[PDB]
C-alpha cells in the first residue's frame, strides 16, 4: 500500500532510462529490416515451440534443441538481431538483480535475527 | 554507475526508511526483548533451521518431525508478540514480491510485443 | 513417444502414486473431505490463500488485514486434528518428493562437476 | 524414507540410460579435441564469471553480452562442441520434465480431490 509508489516510480524511471531506450530502439532496427524480422521470428516460434513442449511435459529429442541452437547462432549472425539478443539479455539479467536488491532490506532483517 | 543499479539500491534505500520496515524492525526489536517469546521465536527457528540443511544433505524426515514443528508453530503463533511479528513479516515479503514484480513490467511488456510478428 | 527418460518417468509418477506413503495422505485427504467442519477450514484457507494469490498475482494492495485473518484461518485449522495431519502429511510428501527430485538431478550434477 | 529407495534407482536409470551416455560421449569428444576443449573451456569460463557478477549483483554492461554471445556463436560452429552444448541442453531439459512429472501426483491431489 505504501510501497507501491514507489514501485510505479521505479517502473516509470526503469522504463524511461536510456538503457530500456536503446532497447527499444534494438528492437525498431529489427521490426523494420525485412531481413532481421525474418530471422527473429524463426528463432521466437522455435523458441515458443520448445518452452511449450516443456509445459507439458512432453518429449524432445536433440533434433529440436540442434535446430535451436542452429538458428540461434545464425541469429547471433545478423547486425541488427545481435545487439537486441545481446541487449535484451543484459536488460533480462539487470533488471533480475533490481529484483534481488529490493528483496535486500529483508534480508537484512533476517540477518538480524 | 548503470543508472538501473544506482534506481534499485534507491529503491533499497526508500523500503529501509519507510513506514512498514521500521513497523517490521520494531517488531522484531518486540519479540527479540520478551524473554518469553523470544525462546519460542528461537526455538521455531532452530527447529525450521535444522529441518532446512537435513533436506539439503537430503535425509529422511519422519512424521514427528513435521508435527513437532507444525506444532511448535501452534505455539508461535498463541503468542502475541511472535504474531505480529509473524504477520508484519509475512505482509512485509509480498509487498516486495509485488514490487520487484512491477520491476519486470517494462521487459514483460517489450516481450509481450516480441509476440507481434 | 520413444525417449526412454520420459517412459521412466511415468513410470515413478505411478510409483508415488501407488506407494504407501502416498496412499497414508490421500487417506488423511479423505478424512478431511468426509467431515464437514474440517472440509469447510480446508476450504476456507483455500479461498483466503486463492484470493490473496489473485490479489499479489494481479499486483494489488494486501494490508494486515488479510494477511492477518489468513493467519488465523491457518490457525484454528492447524487445531483440527482432522486437518493437521493432512497438513502434516501433506508436507511430509512435498518435501520427501523434493529430495526425489534432487536425486535425479545427481548424474548431471556430477558431470557438470566434471565440466570444471 | 520409502521413496528414497525408488529414488536410487531412478538415478541408476538415469545415469545408466543411452541418452546419458551419449551426452558422456559427446564430453568426452570435446575433452580430447584441442580446438574444441580451447573452445568450451573459454566459453565456459565466460558463462562462469557472468554468473558470479550476477550473484554478486556486479553490473554487466553490453560488452560482455555482446563478446559472449560472440563465442556462444563461434562455439556452435565446432561440430563437436555444437553437440556437445546440444545434448547436454536437451539433458538439463528433460531432466526438469522429470523432475516436473514427478510432483504431478501431489499437485493432483492438492487440486482435484475436493
Do not use: C, W
Not at 42 to 70: F, S, T, W
Not at 88 to 105: G, Y
Amino acid at each position: 500500500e505504501p510501497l507501491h509508489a514507489l514501485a510505479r516510480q521505479l517502473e516509470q524511471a526503469i522504463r524511461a532510462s536510456e538503457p530500456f531506450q536503446q532497447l527499444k530502439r534494438a528492437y525498431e532496427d529489427v521490426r523494420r529490416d525485412e531481413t532481421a524480422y525474418r530471422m527473429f521470428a524463426n528463432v521466437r516460434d522455435i523458441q515458443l515451440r520448445l518452452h511449450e513442449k516443456q509445459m507439458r511435459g512432453a518429449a524432445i529429442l536433440p533434433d529440436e534443441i540442434e535446430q535451436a541452437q542452429k538458428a540461434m547462432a545464425l541469429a547471433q549472425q545478423n547486425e541488427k538481431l545481435a545487439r537486441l539478443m545481446a541487449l535484451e539479455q543484459q536488460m533480462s539479467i539487470t533488471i533480475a538483480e533490481v529484483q534481488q536488491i529490493a528483496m535486500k532490506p529483508l534480508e537484512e532483517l533476517h540477518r538480524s535475527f
